[PDB]
C-alpha cells in the first residue's frame, strides 16, 4: 500500500522552524569566512592584516588569478604577489576549504572591502561612473559581491527588498563584464547565477544582525530605523525597470 | 485498391470516447513511478524514511538534483548530511533506471509535502515568490514546483481545471527559462511544449484519487467546496494568456 | 544542329502529360496499401483495435517505440512490447516487412484525424496553442497525415485555403519536433514539409470523391466545397505569419 | 627601363574583338549544350524527345541524384528512372564532358524547362506561392537556373539589369533551400556562388540573341521593344531590398 | 637618465625620412619589374600577346590555372596548358622568380584596366552590380591593379576622391572573392585591402607624371587633375556605404 | 572568536594613500618603458635613435610580427628588418621583461610615435579620414594606444575625462579592426579590453606630470591652463553618443 501512506506523510503539516534549519544547513557556501580568517592569522602572523588589505586591493582591481595578473605587472608588484602566493598558499577559482583565494580573502573581510570600494571606484571592472549612468549616486559600498554579507535580514521586508534590488543592479552589470559567457541573456537568467551566493551571504551566521545593520548605517545606506537612502531606493527601482 | 475501400470501413466505425482516453493515459509519459519511489524510501530509510524525505525535499527545491555537485559549495555540516543521504538511499543524478532514487523523484512522489514546503522556501527557490508576485499578485506558493501537477484533480469542471493549469503554467514558463540556459530566442508556445508533457502526465496519473487530490487543493486554498479557483489562481491564469 | 533545339519548343504545351509524370516521379515515403496488408496479416481480427492504439501511440508519444517505453507506466510498457513483437515495429524507415507507428497513422489518416479532436491537449502542439494563432483552429488538421485526405479536384481558391490553413499547424509543429530549427524563416520551414504534403494530396490512395466526403464530415467544406470560416481564418493567419 | 617599357605596352589602346574572343574561349563551362543534345539523340533515337521531357520533370521536382531519388519513389516511377539511367548512362553531380546528368539535360533544353515551370510551380523546392510572398506575381518562367540560357544580352542595359535581378531573387531563395551549409550567409556571399554559371549561360554562343528575345516576349517577360513586365520590375527591386 | 625620452621627442619630425621608411617597409605582393623581366625572358616576341591572354584569364577565371582549365572548352584548355608550360605558372603566392596570373595582371596594371571596359560583365563583380551602387561606375577602377595607376602628387582632395571611388569596388570585390568577412563592417574589410592599395599608390614603379597621364586617358581626371563626376559620385557612395 | 576581530579590522578606517600606493604597484603593466629604452641603448649604441624611429614606422603601419611582415615586403625593406630583428633581438606578442617588441618600442617612445601619426595618418589600420567621419578634425596625435602615456593625471577632472573620451573614440574603432573576435560586441564590452592598459599608462610613473602636460600643449590638445581643444571636446561627445 503506497497511495494511502503518501497522504498521511503530506498531512504531517509544516514545521517552519525545522525547514529553516535545513535550508541554512544545506545553503550554498562559496567560502567559510571563519576558516579564511583562521588561515590568514596562521600564515601571516602579525602581518596578516597588512597583507589582507593588499589582497583586497589585488582582488578588487586585478581579479582572482594571481599567477595570471603577475605576467602584466610592474617588477615591484610581481615580487609582492609572488611573496603573497607563497606565504598564504594562494590558489585560483574555487578549491578545497583549507585553501585561500584573493576572492575568499575579500569575501571574508567584506567590512573593509566595501569601505575600500569608495577609493577604488574608478579602478573596478564596473566603475562608479558606469553605475551612475544606471542609477544616480549609486552606493560604492554596494559594488562588490561580498556586500551581501553586510545585509541584515532582520530588516523590514520592504527595506530589505530595496537593499537587495539596489545591490543586484551592480551584480547584473558586473556579471556581464566578468563573464564573456554573456551573449544576450535576460536579466532573469543572469540573476540566477548571482542570487544563490547573495542570499547565502545575506543569511549566513557570520557577523550578527545588529552588527551588520550598524555597518549599513555607517556606509549611509539606512537610517536609525533602517529606512534605505534615496540612492538605494533609486537603484532598487532602476533594477526592476532594467533588462 | 481493395485496401482503399477497407480503410473507410474502419474510419466509419466512429469514435469511442472512453476507449481513446484510457489508451492515452496507459501510453502516457512517466518520468517517475511514485509507488516505487515510496517503496524504496521505506526500504532504505526504515523509521527514518520520513525525516530524510523531508530533508531531500528541501535539498531538491533549493539546491537541485545533482547531490555530489551541490556538496562542493556547502557547509561542513550539510555536506556530511548529504553524503549520508547519498549512501543510505543510493542517490543518482538526472533520470536513471526505475529502481533508482533522485532528489527530484523524492520531491515528485511526495508532492503533497513539496508544495506545503514551498510557502516557507519561497525566497530560496530559483524563481522567488517575489518574482512571481511581479507577474500576478499574491501568486500561490503551493504551485511553485512542477510536482504540483500531481495535485490537480482532472474531474474538476473544464473552466476551473483550465484556470488551475494556466495559473501553474505561469510559474513553469518562468522556471523553465531559469533552469535551462539553452532557452535562447524562442516563444511562450515553444517553452510550453517542454513542460506540458510531464504536467498532463502527473495531472491524469492513477497515483492519488481525484477526491483526495481536490481535498489538497481545498486545503492549500486553491479551490472552494464546489471547486471554484481562488482569485489569485484566476489572476495568474489571465496573467499567463497575456504573457510572452 | 541548333535547329532541333528550336523544333523542341514548337511542340506547344501538353499540361496533362506533365501532371501524369509528376505523380509517377513524386516523393513516396511509404505504401498505404502494403501497411494495411501487413496490419491484417500480423493482427488478424485484432488488427483494427491495435491500429487505433498505434495511432494514439504515434500522435502523443512519437515514432520511437523502444525509446518511449523507458518513460512509461508498467501497464503501457507491456502493451507496447506486445505491439512491437506482434507487428514487428521499427524506427524511422525500415524494410517492406516491418511497420512503423508513423506509417500506421499515415495509412489510416481517416481515423487519425478524427482522433485529434479527443487527443487535442496531448499533442506536441495543443489545440489551445493553435487557437492562439487562429480562433477555433480545426483539430482535424493537426497531424501531417491530414494531407492525404485533401481533394485536389477542389476549386483552386478553396484548395489553396485548405492547405494554407493546415500549413499554419505544420509550421508550428515542425518548430516543436525539430530543435535544429531555432530561428529559420517561414519560407525555409515550409520547404521541408511541402514536399510530402503535396505528395499525399496528389496520391492515388483514396479517390477525390471519397476525400471530399471526409472534409465535409469534419466540417471543413460545405456541399459545394466552400471552406469553413475557421479554415479561411487560419489560411490568412498563415500568410501574415513568420 | 622596365617602367618606361610597361606604359608603351599599357597604351597600345583597346580592340574589343581580340579580347572578346578570348573570354568566350576561356569562359566557365558547367555543361556543353551541344554535346548533351548530341548524346541524347545518340542514346535515345526517336524516343530522345519524350525521355528528355521526363528528365526535365525528374530534374525540376526530384533533383540530380537519380539513384538516390529512386529509393523514395513509386513502383512505376522507379521502373521508368532505372530505364533512363541505363539508356542515357546517367551520372551524378558534375562528371566528364561525354557524360549526362538530369541537370545538364534540363540546362541544354532551357526553352522547355522554363515553360514546364508554370505547371510544376507547386512541386519545385521553392514554390510559386513562396516566390509571390517576396514579389507579387513572380514570373514562373524565371524559377530555374537554366533560365539564364534564354536571356538576350543585346537588350538595353537597364532592361537586362531588371531581368537578371528579378531572376536572382529566385536564385537567392533556391540556393538557401538546396544547400544546407548556407545557414545565414549574406545575399552578397550567396550571389557569388550562382552568378559565375549565370553570366556563363547569359553570354553563351548557344542560340542567337534574336531567338532568345523571342522567348522572353512569348513568356510575357518583355514587350516588342524589350521593356520588362511590371512583375519583373517588382521582383528586380524586391532583390535590391532583400537580404 | 630616466629623462632622455623627452630629449629624443624634442628632436622634431622629418616628414621626408618618415614617408621614405613608410615606402620602404611598405607591403609588397609582387615585384612588377621581375614579373616583366621574366615575361620577356619566357615569351620572347610573343610575351605581349600571351600577357594580354593571361590578363583575360586572371580577370575572368581567377589565379588557379590548372583548376580553371578543367571546366573550359577544348580550345581554351589547350591555350591555358601552353601558357602554364611556356611561363612556368604557379598558384597562390610563391617565390619572387615565379609567375602567377594575378602577378601578370598586377604588373601590367595599365593594360588590365583598359581590358576591364570590355570584360565588365565577365568579372566576379559586374559593371551592372557596380552601377547599382554608383551610377556609371568607372570600369577602369574595377581591378586592384588600378591602385598602381594612382598619382600621389595629386591634390589631397582629388587623390582622396579617386581612392574612395576605387575602395567602393575593393569593398564589393573583397566580399565576393573572400568568404572570410561573413558580415564584417566596412572598416574591418578596408583594413585587408588598404595595405596593398597604398603600396601600389606610392611605389617607385611608374612615375607620378606617367600615372596621371593614364588617369587622364581613362577619363578619370582632367588636365588639372579634377576627378570626373562618376568618380566623385562613387567617392561619396563609399562614405555612405556599409 | 573570529567574528569579533573582523570588526576590529573593519574599524581601522581607510588610508587613501596606502591603498592608492598598492593600486599603482599591482596595476597592469603591458611594458616597462625604462627597460625598453635601457635595451635599445644597449643593443643599438649611437644608432639606437634612428632604428627606434624606423621601428615606430614599422609598428604603426606594418604591425608587431616582424618575421611575418618581412615576407610581403621589398628586397631593401626585408633586409633592414632582418638587421633590426638580429640587432635588437625582436620578438612577437608579449614576452619577458628583458625582451623587445615593435609595439613596446612605439609605446616607450610615445612622444615621437604620436608626432609621427600626423604624417602616417593614411597608412594606419584606421585612417585619419575614417576618424574624421566620426568626429570632425580628429586629433591624429591620439591615434595610437601609446598616446595614453602622454596624458597628465594632475589635469582637472573634467579636462582629463574629455582627453580620454576623445582618445577612446579612436581606441573603440581600432580594437574592432585589429581584433576579429569582437564581431558585434557593444561599446561597453570593447572598452573593457582597452581601458585596463590605458589607465595603466596615464597613471604610470614614467615621465613627470608637468612634462606630459607640455606635450599635450605642443600637440595642440590643451591650452596654457589645460582646457582641451574644440576637436577634443567634439570627439569626447562623439564617444558618449557612439555604439
Short mmCIF file of N, CA, C and O in Angstrom, two decimals, chain C residues 103-160:
data_model
loop_
_atom_site.label_atom_id
_atom_site.label_comp_id
_atom_site.label_asym_id
_atom_site.label_seq_id
_atom_site.Cartn_x
_atom_site.Cartn_y
_atom_site.Cartn_z
N UNK C 103 3.80 5.30 -40.08
CA UNK C 103 3.21 4.71 -41.29
C UNK C 103 1.78 4.21 -41.02
O UNK C 103 0.90 4.42 -41.86
N UNK C 104 1.54 3.63 -39.82
CA UNK C 104 0.23 3.13 -39.41
C UNK C 104 -0.74 4.33 -39.31
O UNK C 104 -1.83 4.27 -39.87
N UNK C 105 -0.30 5.45 -38.67
CA UNK C 105 -1.08 6.68 -38.52
C UNK C 105 -1.35 7.32 -39.88
O UNK C 105 -2.46 7.78 -40.13
N UNK C 106 -0.33 7.30 -40.77
CA UNK C 106 -0.37 7.88 -42.10
C UNK C 106 -1.33 7.13 -43.03
O UNK C 106 -2.15 7.77 -43.69
N UNK C 107 -1.24 5.77 -43.07
CA UNK C 107 -2.09 4.91 -43.90
C UNK C 107 -3.55 4.96 -43.48
O UNK C 107 -4.43 4.80 -44.32
N UNK C 108 -3.82 5.17 -42.17
CA UNK C 108 -5.18 5.24 -41.64
C UNK C 108 -5.49 6.67 -41.18
O UNK C 108 -5.92 6.90 -40.05
N UNK C 109 -5.29 7.63 -42.12
CA UNK C 109 -5.48 9.07 -41.95
C UNK C 109 -6.89 9.42 -41.49
O UNK C 109 -7.04 10.26 -40.62
N UNK C 110 -7.90 8.76 -42.07
CA UNK C 110 -9.31 8.96 -41.75
C UNK C 110 -9.63 8.94 -40.27
O UNK C 110 -10.35 9.83 -39.79
N UNK C 111 -9.08 7.96 -39.54
CA UNK C 111 -9.29 7.80 -38.09
C UNK C 111 -8.35 8.68 -37.28
O UNK C 111 -8.74 9.18 -36.23
N UNK C 112 -7.10 8.80 -37.74
CA UNK C 112 -6.06 9.59 -37.10
C UNK C 112 -6.58 11.01 -36.89
O UNK C 112 -6.55 11.51 -35.76
N UNK C 113 -7.14 11.61 -37.95
CA UNK C 113 -7.69 12.96 -37.93
C UNK C 113 -8.90 13.09 -36.99
O UNK C 113 -9.01 14.08 -36.28
N UNK C 114 -9.77 12.07 -36.94
CA UNK C 114 -10.92 12.06 -36.04
C UNK C 114 -10.44 11.99 -34.60
O UNK C 114 -11.03 12.63 -33.72
N UNK C 115 -9.35 11.24 -34.36
CA UNK C 115 -8.75 11.04 -33.05
C UNK C 115 -8.17 12.33 -32.46
O UNK C 115 -8.14 12.49 -31.24
N UNK C 116 -7.72 13.25 -33.34
CA UNK C 116 -7.10 14.54 -32.99
C UNK C 116 -8.00 15.40 -32.13
O UNK C 116 -7.51 16.12 -31.26
N UNK C 117 -9.32 15.34 -32.37
CA UNK C 117 -10.35 16.08 -31.64
C UNK C 117 -10.26 15.76 -30.15
O UNK C 117 -10.27 16.67 -29.32
N UNK C 118 -10.13 14.48 -29.83
CA UNK C 118 -10.04 13.94 -28.49
C UNK C 118 -8.67 14.25 -27.86
O UNK C 118 -8.59 14.80 -26.76
N UNK C 119 -7.60 13.89 -28.58
CA UNK C 119 -6.20 13.99 -28.15
C UNK C 119 -5.62 15.40 -28.24
O UNK C 119 -4.45 15.57 -27.89
N UNK C 120 -6.43 16.39 -28.68
CA UNK C 120 -6.08 17.81 -28.86
C UNK C 120 -5.07 18.34 -27.83
O UNK C 120 -4.08 18.94 -28.23
N UNK C 121 -5.30 18.10 -26.52
CA UNK C 121 -4.42 18.64 -25.48
C UNK C 121 -3.23 17.73 -25.11
O UNK C 121 -2.41 18.13 -24.28
N UNK C 122 -3.10 16.55 -25.75
CA UNK C 122 -1.98 15.62 -25.51
C UNK C 122 -0.91 15.69 -26.63
O UNK C 122 0.20 15.16 -26.47
N UNK C 123 -1.25 16.37 -27.74
CA UNK C 123 -0.37 16.55 -28.89
C UNK C 123 0.79 17.50 -28.59
O UNK C 123 0.65 18.35 -27.69
N UNK C 124 1.93 17.41 -29.34
CA UNK C 124 3.06 18.33 -29.10
C UNK C 124 2.67 19.80 -29.22
O UNK C 124 3.22 20.65 -28.52
N UNK C 125 1.73 20.09 -30.13
CA UNK C 125 1.12 21.40 -30.33
C UNK C 125 -0.35 21.20 -29.98
O UNK C 125 -1.05 20.48 -30.68
N UNK C 126 -0.78 21.77 -28.84
CA UNK C 126 -2.16 21.63 -28.35
C UNK C 126 -3.12 22.48 -29.17
O UNK C 126 -2.70 23.42 -29.85
N UNK C 127 -4.41 22.14 -29.10
CA UNK C 127 -5.48 22.86 -29.78
C UNK C 127 -5.57 24.29 -29.29
O UNK C 127 -5.90 25.20 -30.05
N UNK C 128 -5.24 24.48 -28.00
CA UNK C 128 -5.19 25.75 -27.29
C UNK C 128 -4.08 26.63 -27.89
O UNK C 128 -4.32 27.82 -28.12
N UNK C 129 -2.89 26.04 -28.16
CA UNK C 129 -1.74 26.73 -28.76
C UNK C 129 -2.12 27.21 -30.17
O UNK C 129 -1.75 28.32 -30.56
N UNK C 130 -2.89 26.38 -30.90
CA UNK C 130 -3.35 26.67 -32.26
C UNK C 130 -4.40 27.77 -32.28
O UNK C 130 -4.37 28.61 -33.18
N UNK C 131 -5.30 27.79 -31.27
CA UNK C 131 -6.34 28.81 -31.15
C UNK C 131 -5.74 30.20 -30.91
O UNK C 131 -6.30 31.20 -31.36
N UNK C 132 -4.56 30.23 -30.28
CA UNK C 132 -3.80 31.45 -30.02
C UNK C 132 -3.16 32.03 -31.27
O UNK C 132 -2.49 33.07 -31.18
N UNK C 133 -3.36 31.38 -32.42
CA UNK C 133 -2.84 31.80 -33.73
C UNK C 133 -3.97 32.07 -34.70
O UNK C 133 -3.89 32.99 -35.51
N UNK C 134 -5.03 31.25 -34.62
CA UNK C 134 -6.25 31.37 -35.41
C UNK C 134 -7.40 30.85 -34.56
O UNK C 134 -7.33 29.71 -34.09
N UNK C 135 -8.44 31.67 -34.31
CA UNK C 135 -9.55 31.21 -33.46
C UNK C 135 -10.26 30.00 -34.05
O UNK C 135 -10.41 29.90 -35.27
N UNK C 136 -10.65 29.06 -33.16
CA UNK C 136 -11.34 27.80 -33.45
C UNK C 136 -10.63 27.02 -34.57
O UNK C 136 -11.25 26.64 -35.56
N UNK C 137 -9.30 26.81 -34.40
CA UNK C 137 -8.49 26.08 -35.37
C UNK C 137 -9.04 24.65 -35.54
O UNK C 137 -9.36 24.01 -34.53
N UNK C 138 -9.20 24.14 -36.78
CA UNK C 138 -9.73 22.78 -36.95
C UNK C 138 -8.77 21.71 -36.44
O UNK C 138 -7.65 21.60 -36.94
N UNK C 139 -9.20 20.95 -35.42
CA UNK C 139 -8.37 19.90 -34.80
C UNK C 139 -8.04 18.82 -35.82
O UNK C 139 -6.90 18.35 -35.83
N UNK C 140 -8.99 18.49 -36.73
CA UNK C 140 -8.83 17.52 -37.82
C UNK C 140 -7.61 17.80 -38.69
O UNK C 140 -7.12 16.88 -39.35
N UNK C 141 -7.10 19.06 -38.69
CA UNK C 141 -5.93 19.47 -39.47
C UNK C 141 -4.60 19.31 -38.70
O UNK C 141 -3.54 19.55 -39.27
N UNK C 142 -4.65 18.91 -37.43
CA UNK C 142 -3.47 18.88 -36.59
C UNK C 142 -2.64 17.57 -36.59
O UNK C 142 -2.19 17.09 -35.52
N UNK C 143 -2.32 17.06 -37.79
CA UNK C 143 -1.42 15.93 -38.00
C UNK C 143 -1.00 15.94 -39.44
O UNK C 143 -1.85 16.21 -40.29
N UNK C 144 0.29 15.67 -39.76
CA UNK C 144 0.72 15.69 -41.17
C UNK C 144 -0.05 14.74 -42.07
O UNK C 144 -0.14 15.02 -43.27
N UNK C 145 -0.62 13.64 -41.52
CA UNK C 145 -1.38 12.65 -42.31
C UNK C 145 -2.70 13.24 -42.87
O UNK C 145 -3.29 12.63 -43.76
N UNK C 146 -3.13 14.44 -42.40
CA UNK C 146 -4.30 15.17 -42.89
C UNK C 146 -4.17 15.52 -44.39
O UNK C 146 -5.18 15.67 -45.07
N UNK C 147 -2.93 15.67 -44.90
CA UNK C 147 -2.62 16.00 -46.29
C UNK C 147 -3.16 14.94 -47.25
O UNK C 147 -3.67 15.28 -48.31
N UNK C 148 -3.09 13.67 -46.83
CA UNK C 148 -3.59 12.52 -47.57
C UNK C 148 -5.07 12.29 -47.36
O UNK C 148 -5.50 11.16 -47.08
N UNK C 149 -5.86 13.38 -47.46
CA UNK C 149 -7.31 13.49 -47.30
C UNK C 149 -7.85 14.65 -48.14
O UNK C 149 -9.05 14.71 -48.41
N UNK C 150 -6.95 15.59 -48.51
CA UNK C 150 -7.25 16.80 -49.27
C UNK C 150 -7.53 16.44 -50.73
O UNK C 150 -6.69 15.83 -51.39
N UNK C 151 -8.74 16.79 -51.22
CA UNK C 151 -9.19 16.51 -52.58
C UNK C 151 -8.62 17.56 -53.56
O UNK C 151 -9.05 18.71 -53.52
N UNK C 152 -7.71 17.16 -54.49
CA UNK C 152 -7.13 18.16 -55.42
C UNK C 152 -8.10 18.68 -56.48
O UNK C 152 -7.85 19.76 -57.02
N UNK C 153 -9.21 17.96 -56.75
CA UNK C 153 -10.23 18.36 -57.72
C UNK C 153 -11.03 19.59 -57.24
O UNK C 153 -11.80 20.15 -58.02
N UNK C 154 -10.81 20.03 -55.98
CA UNK C 154 -11.45 21.20 -55.38
C UNK C 154 -11.02 22.49 -56.09
O UNK C 154 -9.86 22.58 -56.50
N UNK C 155 -11.93 23.49 -56.24
CA UNK C 155 -11.56 24.75 -56.92
C UNK C 155 -10.30 25.38 -56.33
O UNK C 155 -10.14 25.41 -55.11
N UNK C 156 -9.41 25.83 -57.22
CA UNK C 156 -8.13 26.44 -56.89
C UNK C 156 -8.09 27.27 -55.63
O UNK C 156 -7.24 27.05 -54.77
N UNK C 157 -9.05 28.22 -55.50
CA UNK C 157 -9.18 29.12 -54.35
C UNK C 157 -9.51 28.37 -53.05
O UNK C 157 -8.97 28.72 -52.00
N UNK C 158 -10.40 27.37 -53.13
CA UNK C 158 -10.84 26.55 -52.00
C UNK C 158 -9.71 25.65 -51.52
O UNK C 158 -9.45 25.57 -50.32
N UNK C 159 -9.01 24.98 -52.48
CA UNK C 159 -7.89 24.08 -52.21
C UNK C 159 -6.72 24.83 -51.55
O UNK C 159 -6.14 24.31 -50.59
N UNK C 160 -6.40 26.03 -52.05
CA UNK C 160 -5.33 26.86 -51.51
C UNK C 160 -5.62 27.18 -50.04
O UNK C 160 -4.75 26.97 -49.20
#
